[PDB]
Each structure stands twice: as structure tokens, then as C-alpha cells.
């Protein structure tokens with residue numbers, strides 16, 4: 001068949017790359033994942049992920065992992081609040097919808113996927129820096145580690161990938177929004193008023209161009225994110241200096257309730273990130289020297305504010321893995337072309353929705369109401 005006596009290199013062990021590896025490996029394909037992280041115990045900073053019926057859940061179902069996801073995920077409702085702490089809307093999880101998109105911790109999702117792979121599928125401390133096409137095989141160059149070869153390379157190393165040029169000359173762009181994220185440990189003790197306002201639900205609030213998103217129970221930690229249009233002055237806050245970030249945020253949140261200000265004051269450290277997009281437009285390069293493609297945020301990074309992100313990437317893994325293993329294609333290149341053509345349609349729809357949603361939500365008069 002297409003991959004008999006051939007091997008596949010996946011670049012990046014995020015949720016998308018590890019899913020791609022499981023879907024190929026369960027079909028008897030020789031596949032390795034190269035992951036820059038030093039070891040499997042690396043904590044992944046970030047909020048939870050939720051898998052959707054028909055995309056992320058379909059990939060887990062094909063892998064035999066859907067029940068494992070359900071068992072480690074948490075169905076969560078959503079509260080909409082104003083800047084004064086008034087709950088404007090409470091949507092609790094109804095038992096009939098409890099399988100719709102339960103929330104999973106990113107380390108828990110990585111553990112499910114790693115435990116599903118054969119020993120030594122993931123090669124840790126392997127930061128890909130360059131590719132070179134040979135006669136039949138790619139040579140992979142890693143930072144300060146020996147080279148490897150593969151018949152097929154799948155780029156899955158996230159939105160800021162610098163190994164995309166064999167596929168496309170498209171560049172990542174800033175969208176003009178900015179995100180500050182943090183975790184609070186023991187939130188029932190350290191931000192009790194804000195914790196009680198969430199009342200076991202996710203919470204969202206918007207006032208004068210500032211958005212706040214919180215999850216009060218990411219494996220017992222509260223995760224929150226504040227998003228706004230990137231200030232022109234920054235076209236001036238040191239994210240290593242918590243006192244500088246606190247000062248900036250308390251000026252921005254000056255007319256919000258003290259339950260929100262308490263969140264800012266008690267946070268031990270903050271992470272800042274400009275919103276970026278890897279825009280799908282014109283098709284990627286045709287006639288590449290050897291078989292290569294991209295999946296996940298490497299293919300279609302987009303703003304996350306409407307819940308686009310990992311589900312598009314898991315759909316990529318499901319489509320590409322099916323094309324490589326279903327025996328219908330005459331070549332790996334044709335299997336790749338078919339996946340890319342499909343991904344350009346659902347990916348452009350997702351990016352269009354994400355970008356329109358970002359425009360609407362950052363108008364200075366928006367409220368989730």
C-alpha cells in the first residue's frame with residue numbers, strides 16, 4: 001500500500017500531531033513524532049480544550065479513545081457577567097448535552113494520546129530546524145541532535161512553525177488583539193469572590209473593549225484570560241514584571257467590581273500573547289520535491305475567541321490518516337492533495353467565522369449581551 005516499507009515523521013507532539021500518530025500507527029504505519037519538549041512531564045500552560053461531535057470526538061472515536069476522553073473531561077456550563085458582577089445569563093449543562101463538548105485539561109489530553117502510542121513513538125528533545133529533500137527521503141535536522149530520515153513529513157508543530165517553506169510562503173500575521181493569561185491555584189481561598197461568581201461555570205464578561213474569560217476548575221486551578229485591542233503605544237508592559245502587568249490591568253479594569261480586581265492583584269505571574277492568524281488564501285505550493293503537508297495550527301492558526309482551534313486540527317488528522325490508509329489513492333501526493341483541498345474549505349470557513357467574531361467582540365460597545 002502507500003506507506004508499506006516507508007516511514008512517517010510528524011513534527012510536533014501537540015494534540016494534533018499525537019492524534020495523527022495514533023491514527024497512522026493503528027494502521028501498522030512506521031511513524032515517529034519529534035517533539036522539542038525535553039520530557040513528557042513538561043506542564044502545558046493554557047485553558048482546557050473541548051472536542052466536538054463530528055470533528056475532535058470523531059478522531060478520538062476512530063482511535064478507540066472516545067470513552068477515555070469522556071472519563072477525564074468535565075461538562076461545564078457558562079455564566080455571562082457584567083463588569084459589576086451581575087450574572088446576566090446562566091446556561092447549566094443539561095444531561096442530554098453532557099457529551100457535546102466536555103472540557104479536558106491539556107496535560108490530561110496529552111497523557112491519553114501518549115498512553116495510546118507504542119513505546120518510543122515520541123522522540124523528546126527533538127527541535128526540528130531544517131528539512132532537505134533527497135532522492136526518495138527527507139533528511140530532518142534537529143537542534144544539537146543527530147539527523148533522521150522519512151518518506152513523508154507531516155508538519156504539526158503549531159502556529160509559529162518556521163519549517164513551512166516547502167509547503168507555502170504564507171507568513172503568520174498579528175490580528176490586532178492581545179491576550180494576557182494566568183492561573184490561580186486554590187482559587188476558593190485566593191480569589192473567593194470571583195470563584196463564587198463563576199459558581200462552577202465558565203465565565204465571560206465584556207466592558208469597553210476589555211474581555212475576560214475564566215474557567216474556575218482546570219484540574220483545581222482557575223485559568224483566566226483578558227483580551228483587548230493591542231494598544232497603539234505598543235506598535236510597554238514587561239510580562240516578567242508582575243508589578244508592571246498588575247499596574248496596567250488595574251488601570252484597564254478600573255470600573256470593574258473588586259471580585260475581578262482581586263483576580264489581577266493575587267495572580268503570581270502573567271503570560272502575554274499577540275493574537276495571530278496563518279491565513280488560508282491562495283493554494284499552497286504544487287509539485288513539492290517529496291511528500292510533505294501540514295496539519296493543526298501549523299496549517300490554519302486562527303483567533304480562538306469563538307472556540308475555533310483544536311477541532312479543525314483533529315479533523316485534519318482524521319482526513320489525512322484516512323487518505324493515507326484507505327487504499328483509494330495512487331500516490332502519497334494525491335492523498336495529501338485531497339486532504340489539503342478539504343482542509344482549505346472547512347479551514348477558510350473557520351478562519352472567516354473566527355475573524356468576523358474577533359471584529360464583533362472587540363468593538364468598544366460589545367457585551368456578550
Ligand SMILES: Cc1cc2c(cc1C)N(C[C@H](O)[C@H](O)[C@H](O)COP(=O)(O)OP(=O)(O)OC[C@H]1O[C@@H](n3cnc4c(N)ncnc43)[C@H](O)[C@@H]1O)c1[nH]c(=O)[nH]c(=O)c1N2
Nearest residue numbers: 012013014015016035036127128157158296297304309310
Ligand atoms: C489563548 C488561547 C486560547 C485557546 C486556544 C489558543 C489560544 C492561544 N485554542 C487553540 C488550540 O490551543 C490550538 O488549536 C491547538 O493547541 C493546536 O494544536 P497543535 O497540535 O496544532 O499545536 P500545538 O501548538 O498545540 O502543538 C505544537 C507542538 O509542537 C512542538 N514544537 C514546536 N516547534 C517544534 C519544533 N521545531 N520541533 C518539534 N516540535 C516542535 C510544541 O512543543 C508542541 O508540543 C483553543 N482551541 C480550542 O479548540 N478551544 C479553546 O478554548 C482554545 N483556546
